[PDB]
Design a protein around this ligand. Structure first.
Ligand code: SF4
Length: 150
């Protein structure tokens, strides 16, 4: 049984600033070694470049600080994540917290002022709407238990 993982959590330099959010986790390493962790970046899959300017949700819209609307790419990446899960039989996701794409518990408020609020990213919202459970890097034991049970 596989999971879809935010590519940045696996150390891939696909973050908006070309950096990575590689996490230290023996369990995630073992899952990867078994070919069960499918790296995925909604923003890069949606057609956005690396690097790219920061973006925040404003309701259903996703915009940059300058007002550029990038919802089309966010929604494409969200739909490609779902497509990958349906094709591979994946029903769990390990996505990056705070992201306008991958956030599951929190996101930035859309005012470009460093203020976080409770909410979810566009990919997470789509995945959960289709019955796929989304966990963050702060919920690895919960995700591991859910995956061990099936
Ligand atoms: S879109 Fe998601 S997977 Fe891609 S770099 Fe941003 S947080 Fe990581």
């Amino acid at each position: 049984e596989k999971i879809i993982v935010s590519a940045c959590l696996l150390g891939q330099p696909v973050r908006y600033d070309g950096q990575s959010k590689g996490i230290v986790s023996n369990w995630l390493d073992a899952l990867g070694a078994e070919g069960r962790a499918l790296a995925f970046c909604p923003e890069v899959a949606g057609g956005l470049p690396t690097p790219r300017p920061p973006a925040e949700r404003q309701g259903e819209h996703v915009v940059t600080e300058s007002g550029l609307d990038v919802t089309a790419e966010f929604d494409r990446g969200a739909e490609l994540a779902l497509g990958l899960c349906l094709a591979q039989g994946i029903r769990f996701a390990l996505l990056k917290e705070g992201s306008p794409s991958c956030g599951s518990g929190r996101i930035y408020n859309g005012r470009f002022e460093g203020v976080s609020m409770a909410g979810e990213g566009k990919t997470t919202a789509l995945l959960r709407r289709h019955g796929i459970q989304v966990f963050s890097e702060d919920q690895l034991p919960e995700l591991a238990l859910a995956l061990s049970l099936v």
